[PDB]
Design a protein around this ligand. Structure first.
Ligand SMILES: OC[C@H]1O[C@@H](O[C@H]2[C@H](O)[C@@H](O)[C@H](O)O[C@@H]2CO)[C@H](O)[C@@H](O)[C@@H]1O
Ligand SMILES: *[C@@H]1O[C@H](CO)[C@@H](O)[C@H](O)[C@H]1NC(C)=O
Ligand SMILES: *[C@@H]1O[C@H](CO)[C@@H](O)[C@H](O)[C@H]1NC(C)=O
Length: 398
């Protein structure tokens, strides 16, 4: 689409870069809402297409027409606030609903210049954030992850691409979903928009999940046919790590009966260990609550190695077949070494209620409380605050 001339007032967010020798140095970054949230419409107010489909065929018979006919409106602070996005110092607050409307924001981290995404190279490094999960019940998903999105939002791929990173263009992930816009241009062919993805944090106050999702194609790839499916180019399922699934049900949850208490602030530290060749080999996780390091628990089911971290042996032993098939941990680390975009979001699912995250073996939720209709009964304003993002040498961010 083509941005209008309305001012874009991206919320500011302080973040830190750290080393064992110098500590953590504060940096200014900006938050940008996804392109879709800005509002992309034709001149008669109609939209340019819905999630899961190609762009409206009348406004977008081709790319140039699509770019001319679909306008993206800039977002002032108010627009951000009404989209459920606000920031304060080093904190980012994401609200699922504002004035009774479903806003469910998805935002990306921008470099201080606002023209490009801050590309994070995590292989061999450490990443820490503080999170407030009390207001996220069964069925909710407060996510902090990385996607190998184009740094300029896809601008360089075409003369018709104008939104750029400045307006949140270029989203992609390992589900290869068909979105109306791809790389800032009309997705005339209806391709699935794929890319390597690292889910560092997918949670609610009842269950937490970690999951690297490798893809055999670097950067953003427009898949066609079977390239988009289960046996295609991206690992949809991922190699997951959820304490409940490896039978350690008292590790995380609401209250005093859990090692990490989801009703109170805590720190999440992730360490991406590389071997001598600089390849990713292991994903480690530990938490900090009440000034105490809480280490992850070792697998408590038979099958997988007795370790408290992700690795190819573990992944293969837990049935992540696509993960292994697409290159496993090393393939994931290559995408991380090339550089990826930090995405943060809040959402729910009318379709499966996030059962894969917090029901049966994944957690303590029944089969219906996670329904969005029930979610609002348990908690009228689901929300999540991610803050104090620190990236740097292993051993120096928390
Ligand atoms: O279901 C749409 C929903 O997706 C969220 O991104 C997912 C990504 O699709 C998936 O591949 C990965 O495994 O987890 C992330 C984070 O949950 C996105 O964050 C939402 O805004 C979006 O509504
Ligand atoms: C596509 O946009 C045109 C307006 O140019 C409108 O007539 C039509 O309803 C839109 N299609 C859909 C499927 O919304
Ligand atoms: C889960 O662990 C408990 C021991 O803490 C044990 O009683 C039970 O059999 C284990 N179940 C599985 C799925 O292995």
């Amino acid at each position: 689409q083509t941005p209008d001339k309305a001012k874009e007032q991206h919320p500011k967010l302080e973040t830190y870069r750290c080393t064992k020798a110098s500590g953590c140095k504060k940096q200014t970054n900006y938050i940008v809402a996804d392109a879709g949230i800005h509002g992309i419409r034709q001149k008669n107010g109609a939209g340019c297409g819905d999630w899961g489909q190609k762009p409206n065929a009348t406004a977008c018979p081709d790319e140039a027409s699509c770019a001319k006919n679909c306008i993206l409106s800039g977002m002032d602070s108010n627009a951000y606030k009404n989209a459920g996005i606000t920031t304060s110092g080093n904190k980012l607050r994401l609200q699922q609903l504002i004035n009774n409307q479903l806003v469910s924001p998805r935002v990306y981290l921008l470099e201080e210049n606002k023209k490009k995404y801050e590309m994070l190279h995590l292989t061999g490094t450490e990443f820490s954030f503080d999170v407030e999960m009390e207001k996220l019940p069964c069925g909710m998903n407060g996510a902090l992850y990385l996607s190998e999105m184009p740094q300029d939002g896809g601008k360089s791929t075409s003369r018709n691409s104008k939104a750029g990173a400045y307006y949140g263009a270029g989203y992609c992930d390992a589900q290869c979903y068909v979105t109306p816009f791809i790389n800032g241009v009309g997705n005339i062919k209806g391709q699935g928009v794929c890319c390597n993805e690292l889910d560092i944090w997918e949670a609610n106050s009842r269950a937490t999940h970690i999951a690297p999702h490798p893809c055999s194609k670097p950067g953003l790839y427009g898949c066609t046919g079977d390239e988009c499916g289960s046996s295609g180019i991206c690992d949809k399922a991922g190699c997951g790590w959820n304490h409940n699934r490896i039978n350690v049900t008292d590790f995380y949850g609401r209250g005093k009966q859990y090692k990490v208490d989801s009703t109170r602030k805590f720190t999440v530290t992730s360490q991406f260990v590389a071997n001598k060749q600089g390849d990713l080999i292991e994903l480690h996780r530990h938490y900090i609550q009440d000034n105490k390091v809480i280490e992850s628990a070792v697998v408590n089911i038979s099958g997988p190695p007795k370790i408290n971290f992700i690795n190819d042996k573990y992944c293969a032993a837990t049935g992540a077949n696509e993960y292994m098939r697409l290159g496993g941990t090393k393939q994931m680390g290559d995408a991380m070494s090339r550089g990826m975009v930090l995405a943060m979001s809040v959402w729910w699912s009318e379709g499966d209620f996030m059962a894969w995250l917090d029901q049966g073996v994944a957690g303590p939720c029944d089969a219906t409380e996670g329904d969005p209709k029930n979610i609002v009964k348990v908690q009228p304003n689901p929300e999540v605050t991610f803050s104090n993002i620190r990236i740097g040498e292993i051993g120096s961010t928390s």
